[PDB]
A paper describes a structure:
In N. gonorrhoeae, the best characterized and most clinically important multidrug efflux system that mediates multidrug resistance (MDR) is the multiple transferrable resistance (Mtr)CDE tripartite efflux pump. MtrD works in conjunction with the MtrC periplasmic membrane fusion protein and MtrE outer membrane channel to actively export antimicrobials out of bacterial cells. The cryo-EM structure of MtrDCR103 revealed that this multidrug efflux pump adopts the overall fold of hydrophobe-amphiphile efflux (HAE)-RND-type proteins and forms a homotrimer. Each protomer contains 12 transmembrane helices (TM1 to TM12) and a large periplasmic domain, which can be divided into six subdomains (PN1, PN2, PC1, PC2, DN, and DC).
The reconstituted sample led to a cryo-EM map at a nominal resolution of 3.02 Å, allowing us to obtain a structural model of this pump. Interestingly, the cryo-EM structure of MtrDCR103 indicates that this multidrug efflux pump forms an asymmetric trimer of which the three protomers are distinct and display different conformational states. Like the structure of asymmetric AcrB, the conformations of the three MtrDCR103 protomers can be classified as the “access,” “binding,” and “extrusion” forms. Unexpectedly, an extra density was found within the distal drug-binding site of the binding protomer of MtrDCR103, indicating that our structure of MtrDCR103 is bound by a fortuitous ligand. The shape of this extra density is compatible with a hydrolyzed, decarboxylated ampicillin (Amp) antibiotic with its four-member β-lactam ring open. This is not surprising, as we supplemented with 100 μg/ml ampicillin in Luria-Bertani (LB) broth to grow E. coli BL21(DE3)ΔacrB/pET15bΩmtrDCR103 cells for overproducing the MtrDCR103 protein. Within 4.5 Å of this bound deactivated Amp, there are five hydrophobic residues, including F136, I139, F176, V607, and F610, which provide hydrophobic interaction at this distal site to stabilize substrate binding. In addition, N135, S275, and T277 are involved and perform an electrostatic interaction to anchor this inactive drug. Interestingly, a positively charged residue R174 is found within the vicinity of this Amp binding site. The cryo-EM structure of the MtrDCR103-Amp complex indicates that at least 17 phosphatidylethanolamine (PE) lipids are anchored within the transmembrane domain.
Numbering used by the authors:
A (entry chain A): 151 to 250
B (entry chain B): 1 to 1040
C (entry chain C): 701 to 750
D (entry chain C): 51 to 150
E (entry chain C): 851 to 900
The structure:
Amino acid sequence: EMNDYAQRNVVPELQRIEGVGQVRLFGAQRAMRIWVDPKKLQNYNLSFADVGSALSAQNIQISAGSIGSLPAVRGQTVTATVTAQGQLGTAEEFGNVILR
Amino acid sequence: MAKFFIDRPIFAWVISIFIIAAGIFGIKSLPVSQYPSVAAPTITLHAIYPGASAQVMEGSVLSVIERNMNGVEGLDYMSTSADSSGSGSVSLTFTPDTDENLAQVEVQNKLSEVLSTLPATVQQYGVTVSKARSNFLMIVMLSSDVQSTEEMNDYAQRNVVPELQRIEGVGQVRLFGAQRAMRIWVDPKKLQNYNLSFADVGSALSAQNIQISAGSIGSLPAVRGQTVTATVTAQGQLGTAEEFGNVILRANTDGSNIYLKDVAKVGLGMEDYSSSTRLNGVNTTGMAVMLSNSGNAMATAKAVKERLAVLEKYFPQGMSWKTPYDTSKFVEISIEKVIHTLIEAMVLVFVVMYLFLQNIRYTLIPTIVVPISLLGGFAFISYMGMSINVLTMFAMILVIGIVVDDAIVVVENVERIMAGEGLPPKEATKKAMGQISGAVIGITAVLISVFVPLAMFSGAAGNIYKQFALTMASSIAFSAFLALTLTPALCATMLKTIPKGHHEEKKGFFGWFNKKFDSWTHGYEGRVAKVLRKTFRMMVVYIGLAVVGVFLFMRLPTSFLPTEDQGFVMVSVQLPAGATKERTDATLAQVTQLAKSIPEIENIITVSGFSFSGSGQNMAMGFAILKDWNERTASGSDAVAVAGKLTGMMMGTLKDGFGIAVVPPPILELGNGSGLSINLQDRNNTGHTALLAKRNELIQKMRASGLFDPSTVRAGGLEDSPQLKIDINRAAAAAQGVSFADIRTALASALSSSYVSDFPNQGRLQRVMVQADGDARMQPADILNLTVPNSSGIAVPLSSIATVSWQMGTEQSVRFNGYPAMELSGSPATGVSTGQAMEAVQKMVDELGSGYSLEWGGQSREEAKGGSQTIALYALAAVAVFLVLAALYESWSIPLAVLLVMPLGLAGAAAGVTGRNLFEGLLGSVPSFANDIYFQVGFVTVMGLSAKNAILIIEFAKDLQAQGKSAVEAALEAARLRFRPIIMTSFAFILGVVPLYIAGGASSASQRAIGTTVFWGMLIGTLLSVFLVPLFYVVVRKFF
Amino acid sequence: KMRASGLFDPSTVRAGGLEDSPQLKIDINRAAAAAQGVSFADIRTALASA
Amino acid sequence: GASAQVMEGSVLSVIERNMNGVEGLDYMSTSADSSGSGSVSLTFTPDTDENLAQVEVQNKLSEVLSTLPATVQQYGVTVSKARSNFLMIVMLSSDVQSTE
Amino acid sequence: GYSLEWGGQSREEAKGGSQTIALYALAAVAVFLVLAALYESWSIPLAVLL
């Protein structure tokens, strides 16, 4: 938690000083680590490439667009931007990633 | 020097010739513009990503770009801005004294490795690295009334743009509009009828529309016996819409394959259809000709107009160029004003010298001395790498009296010695030079010591003051060197020997003028002798005048540059959220019909879909450009009255939306009128509603419990908008045959556009874009779900899985220094400085919880610094002038006698601007005079000239005491000897600034602000100095 | 007209550019490609891998 | 896969027409053969350092990198501020092996 | 419409055509100004320019 708070609030604030060239944080920031048991992949006949394809296909930003764009017909009045989340940000959501 | 240059007139004449030649070579090698390099290096990116909201674009590109733009040498601050259009801008502002090219290539080298983790959509359009600091020369408009916007844009890009940026002087031409592209208007009903989609259409557009590299017959590893080598050309790329209409999508087993002309609509169009430009109601393109550094602006505009006439000789039926706004005409009127005041100053100096010195051979001396000093000042301008602009010419206007004053006071002493002693002009000029050589050396050193700390500030005001300092100090030094060398030769060779008794025994008009001037001098000497007895009452009334001058100076408002008329008024139309382009165009047509009913407005430029306060489908802007200054010579003809009448007509006629009409200020980098901006940042990254609640709490605390003019304080960003968010249920998709990439591809193909490949269109290469059908995407009902991963699979639409419902979401995202922020606006309403308002808003943001900070941006960063740059430098300049006077007079107390004319100019200038404000407040508009840059430099010039007069009086009084005279007697003879040249240079300066007092037209506000300041300062300073300087000498001689 | 004039000696005044050579030109007929059943990816790969 | 017409018209033309505005530049000379290899030669004024000109060329080049085709953005535009004449020709000779 | 341009040494040789008379006039007026400064006469340096 302190290494994640240092990378987001302490490191980019003190590296804008005239003279500072490198800020080497002894540690690492936050990431989502998935520890896979290889003995369970032999039972369900799965591989790491299937997990990678399921993580690349189900976790992506969905940029839909807008309703009533600028090349419109004569008569359009209401314009509303469509926003789709379509993304994962918690561990209990990442636990339900569909493989097969 | 003075004894050496009198017996050798050619030795000074050739030095004057060298200074003339250096000034000519400097004038012929100076850049011409209107405003100098005031700005800091600023880098703008302008990334493109169509079909996205503000938060998605922010979390996609802005957080990845801004997290790696740290460590660059000289970075001051950074900000990112995004909206719902699809274009985000990252403004990186650097520190001064930093090279902008190295900073720009450092941002480019950082973006070269930032771009590797960017998505594939922003890599096709590319993220450029540009600079915000750019010049501005001309605007070229093209109206045809028979063609469209895209055809005129293509004609300008093919025949006008490559011919305008090839001449000398033009730096960069930027078009205002989208280029041509191949739009494929695809109907999804034919796709779901023929069981197609958009992915196969994009794959076909990437597959058939492609370039082939076939190689060459007879390569280098050849066989024994080959003689002929030939290359193979295989052109398999489409370039016609009829060729694009026959793109095979899927071939059947029997025949009749699916084309692109039966399930879609292929045709030429624009790229985004966002921005439009109109001039008086017709279709009009846009070109912003930007000047380059070290170039000319007067000849460049004439060359652009000649090239436009050559192109108009080959224009088609309808098209005609028209330039509504030009900045090159801003500088020819200034040079014309400089030449006009120079000619008028020569005329008045000739008139005064013919009235006083009663001859014509004396008048030839300053008319040679002054232009060589002007050329030496121009040579010192060109040596330091400066340029010619409005501030340089205003400083050359303000230095006119200073370079004639040393020419007058030398020849006055020469004529006085020749009339008194009857000597030949050689010995008389030698005696006058031995009298006043050290005096003019001390005057020159005092003027240099005054004008040096003006060029020592930091910021925009320092960049403004540096031009005035480096012009006026150089002109003073060159005029002093000319008065030391060349002027004794002109008084020695050109002058005639005065006749004893017969000269100064006039008959005619003058003898009466000589008798009246002698009676006035006797009355002035009697008044001085009456003043020189009661020293205590005169001292306490001088102390009272000094403290009331400090009191009148302290109660003045502050400014940097006052606003002035430029010839155009900027208007902005802001419709409510959820508005299309048809209501925006109707309101802009109403704005045009309102602006056509005003006789002051000449043209009107109308821009739809783009504004300075955020771009969108409802924002719009306009520029109402007025007529010339000759036909607008009235009371209600300035841009402020036109803006007020336009606001009053917009509030009464424009029903849909609201539109404000404000005058454009001076230089944007100097935000005079921004007040106090607050960027309320968040550190813990809570959300958007908590930051909005905190911004509302700050607004309510600054309105009800504040003094920040509560009628005008508001959020200076953009309000929220209703949206059409969805919630894709993964549990319903996992229990059915619904994947996740198919919904993404369906939404990105329906509600947004796609860029697949390029195609050649008459030499150049343009884009090919698929936008499906426009009519289908009108209602919020979206039913397109498909793609079961084993078949076509039409099972259920996006009704139970999507759960479409309306929401309220923001349409703008602004981040400051990595953290998101909200833009505010303050105002120092009623006589309150910003130094306590900053502490008040600091306490208001400190009394909240931990995790909410602030950051002053724009103009408030220079006012955030302490006040140790004006008072300390002024005290150092004053003590350095004191030490120069102690070196001159060989004493310590008499420099304190000279230093008592310094509050007199401040008191006179403050009383003059207060009288002008109270005179214009009862008979006109709001007083627009304050403690700006022009008032300060006028106070500096009247301080220098009053100090010069005081040094001359003190040097004339000090040498008369060594011959067995007292203090009051030497002061009386010094006043009697110096009554004439002081009133001579005062009459010359006042008659020179009389046209500067009532000047009207282009840039007339700055001319009035310098003119009334130097007028009242010179008047009150002379009328107090000629009665107080012998009193100061007397009360110092006895006091010590 | 620059040669054989007395000021410029012959056999040394030539052009400084590469002269034009006869090249091979391929015109793809998409109508026969649609009627016979060959896509554009096959001819492109053949011409780029030959 | 380009001739001498579209290569100098789509790649070298925009670079030549947008390279104007740089101070010191006296003349330009672009050349493109039939093998698809362009060469823009920018000649400056004498008495002027290459340190500022070499970064102003890269500043005026990166603005037109987005309107360039996607093929020339992968190979990039190489900047070589070298002379054209030859100083020395080092010849290596051996009678025991081939020249490769 | 058919205009010519030079290259390399020819550009410098074409640029150094009008420099000679201007250089001679500048050297002559420099000698004139220096000898008028030193010997304090206008008639002295006119006999040196001959």
